[PDB]
Amino acid sequence: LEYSELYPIQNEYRMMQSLDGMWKFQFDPEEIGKKSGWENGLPAPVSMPVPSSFADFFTDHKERDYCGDFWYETEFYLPAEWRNKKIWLRFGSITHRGTVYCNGMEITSHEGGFLPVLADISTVAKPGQVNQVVVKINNELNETSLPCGATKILNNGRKLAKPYFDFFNYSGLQRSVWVIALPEESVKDYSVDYELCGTDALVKYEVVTTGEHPVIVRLLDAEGELVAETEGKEGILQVANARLWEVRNAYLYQIVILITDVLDEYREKIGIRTVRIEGTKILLNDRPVYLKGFGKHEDFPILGRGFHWGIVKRDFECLKWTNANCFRTSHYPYAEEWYQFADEEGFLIIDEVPAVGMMRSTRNFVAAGSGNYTYFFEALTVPELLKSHIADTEEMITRDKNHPSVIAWSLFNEPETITDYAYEYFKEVFAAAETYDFQSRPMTGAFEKNSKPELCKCYPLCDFICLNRYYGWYISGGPEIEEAEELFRDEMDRWKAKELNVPFVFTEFGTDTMAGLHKLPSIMWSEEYQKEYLEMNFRVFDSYEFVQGELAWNFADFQTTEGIMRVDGNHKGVFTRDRQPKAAAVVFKDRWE
């Protein structure tokens, strides 16, 4: 990379200052901003909270559904003491594409709206004065960046996003923004890997700095006492009587990285843990673990994908209530704070890159069950798609690798995988992913039903196999649910017959469920049917030895593109959007207990 992905901290060597609050905001429908010098300040702005998605604040269609260029602006005072430091703007994310300006100068551009953006403003920053940042953002959708979709142009010239994915195209500055000051020679990146040796543990590490001075690495336990110390950008910390990080029983050490001439110090909490695939088993610290939990979303009323600690608190309290131990970051990397808390709460995370919508369809959720092939990986643009896919894969892994909670990388969700065009594509992604991960932890992806065991060319790439199946909803279901169970067992029997000796994890299954809709006997959208559907699925899961995980879809109701198949978003949630349990929630709780 060309910047540090590390989470900002505050010490004697590093400073940070928040830019969160009310920013200036202006739509640029005619796209004349750059021509008109908006990079020096917006001419007629409104107020916009940062962090948040902008869409749900407004009361008119034009603004909520805005697609194209729009601008942010704010001012901030730089402390005079920040002089002669490397000064960076750190955006938690810019969705989807952006150009950062500071004091009139173009600093950097970024592609991908769910990972941090860093802008080196050292030479242009004015310490001891008020400074200006202006950001030009674009939220269009294409097939050359993630996530994939299309942008429709109406006859008045207004643009409209047409996703190939099933969630609303929220955008803006949805995560916290910092200005930070680093020493001229600094810790840029680090990596840990773990090995268990009886009661001892080895922490293999790697450190990348912006200079050549010696590096000291210390490991402190939860109370701050030194347990290991090494020198070098590569080495091994030896921990006697290591207190291992356990599922729903976390222990966190604090790693301390020092550049000495001290020139720089970085601290971060980590957990000693191993993850391995052996046969059909997923081994955490050598003991088989069964994944229980949900696919989630960064989604909440009014805030959109805007981060807030309160959402995290309620969501984890609910997870623990259902006795879950895992969730997948569908369908994109979350705000860094989610992983930090998962580390402390002892939750497992399948970390997913935004590789969703790689099958050309504007109502993809039902097109996944009919095998109509869209020639997606045969397009003239896929080299661009692959490059940005690998880029997002790199940024995610560099960012999240040192979290103990992250046990696997999901590198796609429901793409076309039945041709060799697809295989050659993902062969590259998997190769790249393994290169970026210091731990080489399990790599997988979520397959849709179209990827028949007889046709799929991509599952051999996976360390374990994640299936999204909706036998009971999109396939048969309702009156035909007994046929759905027969069809479901039939596909699993075919997978079993392959004798792959790899773990299978169901990463999606569910039914849209209206809070309050009761029916006796049950009907598809009712609360009772959600329960009956789950119990049928549970029966199938328990019929196969190599099934080692069940992640239900979804944790909570979330916002989608409006259409004839989405009644105010997606209602396959087990909890409502306001985080209250439907009837089927206790079914998970009793089972997972």
Ligand X SMILES: O=C(O)[C@H]1CNC[C@@H](O)[C@@H]1O
Binding site for beta-D-glucuronate: what residues are annotated?
A: 166, 331, 413-414, 474, 508, 553, 566, 570, 572
Using CB under 8 A, list all residues that contact a copy of itself.
Answer: 10-12, 15, 17-18, 20-22, 47-50, 52, 56-59, 76-77, 79-81, 128, 301-303, 306, 308-314, 317-318, 320-321, 341, 344, 577-579
Closest to ligand X by CB, 171 or 570: 570
Closest to ligand X by CB, 298 or 508: 508
Judged by beta carbon distances under 5 to 8 A according to partner kind, the member of a copy of itself, ligand X, none in contact with residue 481 is: none
Does the protein bind ligand X through residue 417 (CB under 6 A)?
A: no
> Among all chains, which residue has been given the structure tokens 């080895």?
202
Closest to ligand X by CB, 101 or 365: 365
Distance CA 126, CA 80 (A): 9
Rg value, the chain, Cα: 24
Closest to ligand X by CB, 168 or 365: 365
x-marked contacts with ligand X along 567-586 as a string, rule CB under 6 A: ---x-x--------------
Q: Which two tokens stand for residue 451?
A: 């990827």
User: How large is the angle between the packed helices 527-541 and 481-497, nearest 10 degrees?
Assistant: 30
* Minimum CB distance to a copy of itself, residue 54 (Å): 9
Which residues within the stretch 315-334 sit at the binding site for ligand X (CB under 6 A)? 331
Does the protein bind ligand X through residue 553 (CB under 6 A)?
A: yes
* Minimum CB distance to ligand X, residue 366 (Å): 8
> Among all chains, which residue has been given the structure tokens 């909570």?
556
Bridge partner residues of 447 (DSSP): 467
Which residues within the stretch 155-184 sit at the binding site for ligand X (CB under 6 A)? 166
* Minimum CB distance to a copy of itself, residue 98 (Å): 21
CA angle 48, 54, 59 (to 5 degrees): 95
Residue from 268, 508, 527, 550 carrying the catalytic annotation: 508
Residue from 414, 416, 527, 550 carrying the catalytic annotation: 414
414 given a catalytic annotation: yes
Judged by beta carbon distances under 5 to 8 A according to partner kind, the member of ligand X, a copy of itself, none in contact with residue 218 is: none
Judged by beta carbon distances under 5 to 8 A according to partner kind, the member of ligand X, a copy of itself, none in contact with residue 553 is: ligand X
Residue 272 and residue 253 in contact, taking contact as beta carbons nearer than 8 Å: yes
Does the protein bind ligand X through residue 298 (CB under 6 A)?
A: no
State phi, psi for 408 to the nearest 5 degrees: -160, 155
Other C-beta atoms closer than 10 Å to the C-beta of 274 total 18
Closest to ligand X by CB, 218 or 572: 572
Judged by beta carbon distances under 5 to 8 A according to partner kind, the member of a copy of itself, ligand X, none in contact with residue 311 is: a copy of itself
Does the protein bind ligand X through residue 588 (CB under 6 A)?
A: no
Other C-beta atoms closer than 10 Å to the C-beta of 451 total 25
Going by C-beta distance under 8 Å and a sequence separation of 6 or more, which residues neighbour residue 417? 423, 426, 447, 450, 451, 456, 457, 458, 459
* Minimum CB distance to ligand X, residue 356 (Å): 7
The helix (run of H) or strand (run of E) holding residue 265 is: strand 264-270
Closest CA relative to residue 112, chosen from 88, 90, 137, 133? 137
Does the protein bind ligand X through residue 508 (CB under 6 A)?
A: yes
Residue 451 and residue 458 in contact, taking contact as beta carbons nearer than 8 Å: yes
378 given a catalytic annotation: no
Overall size of the chain counted in residues: 593
Judged by beta carbon distances under 5 to 8 A according to partner kind, the member of a copy of itself, ligand X, none in contact with residue 570 is: ligand X
Judged by beta carbon distances under 5 to 8 A according to partner kind, the member of ligand X, a copy of itself, none in contact with residue 545 is: none
Closest to a copy of itself by CB, 10 or 381: 10
Distance CA 192, CA 190 (A): 7
Closest to ligand X by CB, 164 or 253: 164
Residue 393 and residue 436 in contact, taking contact as beta carbons nearer than 8 Å: yes
Does the protein bind ligand X through residue 410 (CB under 6 A)?
A: no
Buried b / exposed e over 539-565, threshold 16 CB at 10 Å, is ebbeeeebbbbbbbbbbbbbbbbeeee
* Minimum CB distance to ligand X, residue 479 (Å): 20
Which residue ranges make up the annotated binding site?
166, 331, 413-414, 474, 508, 553, 566, 570, 572
DSSP string computed for 190-243: EEEEEEEETTEEEEEEEEEESS-S-EEEEEE-TTS-EEEEEESSEEEEEETT--
Residue 147: asked if its preceding bond is cis (omega within 30°), the reply is yes
Does the protein bind ligand X through residue 468 (CB under 6 A)?
A: yes
x-marked contacts with ligand X along 129-148 as a string, rule CB under 6 A: --------------------
* Positions marked catalytic: 414, 508
Point out which residues bind ligand X (CB under 6 A).
166, 331, 365, 414, 468, 508, 553, 570, 572
